[PDB]
Amino acid sequence: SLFNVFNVTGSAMSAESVRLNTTSSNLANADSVSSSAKDTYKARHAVFGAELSDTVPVKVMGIVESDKPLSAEYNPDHPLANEEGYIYKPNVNVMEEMANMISASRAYQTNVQVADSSKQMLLRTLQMGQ
Amino acid sequence: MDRALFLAMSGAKQNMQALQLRANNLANVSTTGFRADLAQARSMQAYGEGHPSRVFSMTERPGHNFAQGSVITTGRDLDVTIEGSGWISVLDHTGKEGLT
């Protein structure tokens, strides 16, 4: 049943889209010392999962911030400076976010190829015998 | 289409705004009694249903650099500079008191 392939590729494409949006936010918030409520932005990362026990769909199970320390900068005249004159900025690393942009896009496009190829195989089964 | 186009567009638009804010400071290097404007970015998450993956960044002016400026000695009686921290009370053309 190739219709299962559609579920798996669709779940993979959804997972890559979540990863791409996470990368988009990290690049946009790699220079933000402030935040909406009260907590400095930390590089977010989606968590993929495989519930192996046919096909095993890939599901995103939540967003987890990176555990790297916040990059402290000496801005003593800044309003938000601490007692030592340090301000903290998000731990977003440019090199790894660019790799995620490349990896997520290439992984997204190859799952479309599988679904398109799997779509053809179902059609040829319909034409079998006639 | 993916909403990441607008998530990145909204960041690129704000980076231009911060660039213009820094441009005004460089255009006002020689201005008398000019306090440079500070620029930063704020992260505002898009709260709602779904995975928390979309956070916007918008620029703001948290404050100004209130440090003492570069004092120019002119030898003129009607030229004064504030020592340390302070302000001079003036009213503009609207008769509204403001510090200068």
């Binding site: 939540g62 | 779904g50 995975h51």
Partner: peptide
């Protein structure tokens, strides 16, 4: 569930007793 996962709801905080108290 995954530990340390972020939430998609405003982060209950301090000022405005309303959040500090209601679970």
């Amino acid at each position: 569930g995954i530990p340390g996962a972020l939430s998609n709801q405003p982060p209950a905080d301090a000022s405005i007793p309303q959040d500090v108290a209601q679970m």
